[PDB]
Amino acid sequence: HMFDFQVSKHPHYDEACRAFAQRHNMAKLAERAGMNVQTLRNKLNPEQPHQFTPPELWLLTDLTEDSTLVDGFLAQIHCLPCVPVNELAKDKLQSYVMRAMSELGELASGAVSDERLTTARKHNMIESVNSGIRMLSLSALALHA
Amino acid sequence: SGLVPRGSHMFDFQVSKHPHYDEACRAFAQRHNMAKLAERAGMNVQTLRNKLNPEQPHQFTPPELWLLTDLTEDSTLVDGFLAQIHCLPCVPVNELAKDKLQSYVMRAMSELGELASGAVSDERLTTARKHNMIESVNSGIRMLSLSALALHAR
Amino acid sequence: MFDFQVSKHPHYDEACRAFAQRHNMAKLAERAGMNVQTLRNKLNPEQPHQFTPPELWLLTDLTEDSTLVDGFLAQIHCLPCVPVNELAKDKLQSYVMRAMSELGELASGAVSDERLTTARKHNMIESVNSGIRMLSLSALALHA
Amino acid sequence: GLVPRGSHMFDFQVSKHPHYDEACRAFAQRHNMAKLAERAGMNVQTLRNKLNPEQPHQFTPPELWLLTDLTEDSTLVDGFLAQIHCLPCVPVNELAKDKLQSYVMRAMSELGELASGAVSDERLTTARKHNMIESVNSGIRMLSLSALALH
């Protein structure tokens, strides 16, 4: 229901900015992003007070397909790296909710065992988690119809 | 436009045409008392509201996003940030209970049940109602992701 | 959700008439600690006398006859009652987890009208029965 | 204590737990007894005495149907049935074949509510316990309707 979100004291986002800066050409990237080259360097420089805006983070992650800035952003608050999702919702919201209940029922079914949890059963339960996550994401996209 | 085939799933982290982060900002401003939050965040309250308003140029820095999430225990802004680039909501693991798979599964049912509640409701969808079902979706994704990590002990 | 409505068919009146004819009024009245004429008037729809809930429970338990309760339920468009006598030996969360599995299999069916069939109905009914049992046991576990 | 357990053989045994009395207390606390008494056409103090276990007054069958009709709340009927070890009531006057998916999703909501209390670290007060029993009875109601929706 609730979580205790904490801010890590390890420079996850700062170290990610340095790696991103060293991975791509700052000159081309700043032009593609509509930014001045020095401003992009300052926003990636932890020793400079300049910071990215959210749309600047989206654009540079979009233009590069590199989640380094987002992964370090998420690791700064003890969160796992980001997961890309890009599929459309072609069915009604109600159908996605019901299929999510079926996948969750199989996860609960495997969680009460009733048989030895082999490698195949653990993999099938991971697939149910993968499908349940997929049905939940599409449920959210059905709300944007 | 309309004649180039669907070309956005071939690329990762594409900026969505939907204003996910802007909708998340407005829902966040509605839920929390801005005066009390700005006092804890050490910022002016009007500047906080401007950072939550798309029509104003003020925007959050990453340190402020981490701070607001920490202070409110609300991942709405982060989850909207991630939805803006076609990503799943965030999954915190600082409280990961490796031997509590059953707890994560039951908390997933609580979120799925609240999602199901909104789906069968005959009420006109309100932005608050839409975002509460979004939150239930993101909460369910969180419990399911944590369930997978907790599966290692079972 | 539900729009409970009182039926205009006297389902409870006919249940009382069938109950009074089935059992011996003299023995049943003294077994329930009630006057025979009072019991007859409580079963006679033409008489204003009515049963209290304690009197309905007692007569149902004494006779093992759900006729009065089923007619009581049919008066508000409810199905006949279902007795359960199983004990709860397991913890609350174990029942809820097993309830998710049955509801998931029930939710596995439906969704798409296309599969349909009758074999799927039987397994969906089976999941419904197991789910009801898990929910009923959960209520008994709540009385710790 | 040496006679074997035989309560599972006899149906409709009257429970020693005050199921119906607890339901009367929860019903009286949820609705205002002055407005409902006017809708029911009965005296307010007479209505409160029938919902009060420490008072000899009790409801008649027509009064129980009437209140269930006016309130759309099956609390009194479900407590009535639980007193003789019976499942809660299932209304069928709105049963429809095309309502199957709605029945299943409502059951998910009730099971989700029960799942919340089952993982809660806070102590279960009788008000919190009553909300879970309520969700149990509603869930059983939704599951039964799902079975009847298949005919």
User: Residue A107's CB: how many other CB atoms inside 10 A?
Assistant: 31
- Co-location of A24 and A69 in the same domain: yes
On whether residue C102 sits in a domain, the answer given is: yes
Indicate the number of domains in chain A. Answer: 2
- Co-location of C15 and C65 in the same domain: yes
- Co-location of B76 and B117 in the same domain: no
- Co-location of D40 and D75 in the same domain: yes
For chains C and D, count residue pairs whose Cβ atoms are closer than 8 Å.
181
d(CA D69, CA D62) in angstroms, rounded, equals 10
- Co-location of D64 and D106 in the same domain: no
Q: Which residue of B has its CA nearest to C98?
A: B106
Cα-atom radius of gyration of chain B, to the nearest Å?
Answer: 18
Range(s) of the domain holding residue A117: 93-142
Whether residue B126 lies within 8 A of chain A, CB to CB, comes out as no
Of B110, B117, B119, the CB nearest to D116: B110
- Co-location of D143 and D117 in the same domain: yes
What lies within 8 Å, CB to CB, of A28 at 6+ separation is none
Across the strands, what pairs with B92? A79
Residue D20, SS3?
A: helix
On whether residue D9 sits in a domain, the answer given is: no
- Co-location of B70 and B31 in the same domain: yes
- Co-location of A61 and A99 in the same domain: no
Residue with tokens 């009460």: A112
Buried-exposed string C8-35: b where 16+ CB fall within 10 A, e elsewhere = eeebbbebbbebbeebebeebbeebebe
On whether residue A7 sits in a domain, the answer given is: no
d(CA B18, CA D118) in angstroms, rounded, equals 38
d(CA D13, CA D92) in angstroms, rounded, equals 26
Long-range contacts made by residues D75-79, C-beta under 8 angstroms, separation at least 24? D75/D23, D75/D26, D75/D27, D75/D30, D75/D134, D76/D20, D76/D23, D76/D24, D76/D27, D77/C73, D77/C76, D77/C78, D78/D23, D78/D137, D79/D19, D79/D20, D79/D21, D79/D22, D79/D23, D79/D24
- Co-location of D145 and D120 in the same domain: yes
Neighboring chain C residues of B117 at a CB cutoff of 8 Å = none
Resolution of this model in Å is 2.1
> What amino acid occupies position A92?
K
What lies within 8 Å, CB to CB, of D13 at 6+ separation is C61, C85, D7, D84, D85
On whether residue C6 sits in a domain, the answer given is: no
What is the least distance, in Å, from the CA of C104 to any CA of chain B? 11
On whether residue B9 sits in a domain, the answer given is: no
On whether residue D88 sits in a domain, the answer given is: no
Whether residue B96 lies within 8 A of chain A, CB to CB, comes out as no
Of C97, C102, C111, the CB nearest to A111: C97
- Co-location of C100 and C131 in the same domain: yes
Report residue D135 CA to chain centroid gap.
10
d(CA D36, CA D42) in angstroms, rounded, equals 9
Nearest to A83 by CA among B61, B106, B148, B99: B148
Query: For residue D78, what are its two tokens?
Result: 């479900």
Q: Please answer whether residues B76 and B24 qualify as being in contact, where contact means their C-beta atoms are separated by less than 8 angstroms.
A: yes
Please give the backbone phi and psi of residue B92, each rounded to the nearest 5 degrees, phi first. -80, 145
Across the strands, what pairs with A44? none
Query: Which among C96, C102, C134, C138 is the top mutation candidate for probing chain B, defined by the most B β-carbons within 10 Å of its own β-carbon?
Result: C96
Q: Please answer whether residues D25 and C21 qualify as being in contact, where contact means their C-beta atoms are separated by less than 8 angstroms.
A: no
Residue C112, class by beta-carbon neighbours within 10 Å (0-12 exposed, 13-18 middle, 19+ buried)? exposed
The residue among B84, B109, B135 that closes a domain is: B84
Across the strands, what pairs with C83? D86
DSSP string for residues in C16-40 = HHHHHHHS-HHHHHHHTT--HHHHH
On whether residue B49 sits in a domain, the answer given is: yes
The residue among C74, C106, C124 that closes a domain is: C74
Q: Please answer whether residues B75 and A5 qualify as being in contact, where contact means their C-beta atoms are separated by less than 8 angstroms.
A: yes
- Co-location of B116 and B67 in the same domain: no
Q: Please answer whether residues C64 and C22 qualify as being in contact, where contact means their C-beta atoms are separated by less than 8 angstroms.
A: no
On whether residue C82 sits in a domain, the answer given is: no
The answer to whether the CB atoms of A102 and C108 lie below 8 A apart is yes
The residue among A49, A76, A103 that closes a domain is: A76
What is the least distance, in Å, from the CA of B43 to any CA of chain D? 35
- Co-location of C16 and C65 in the same domain: yes
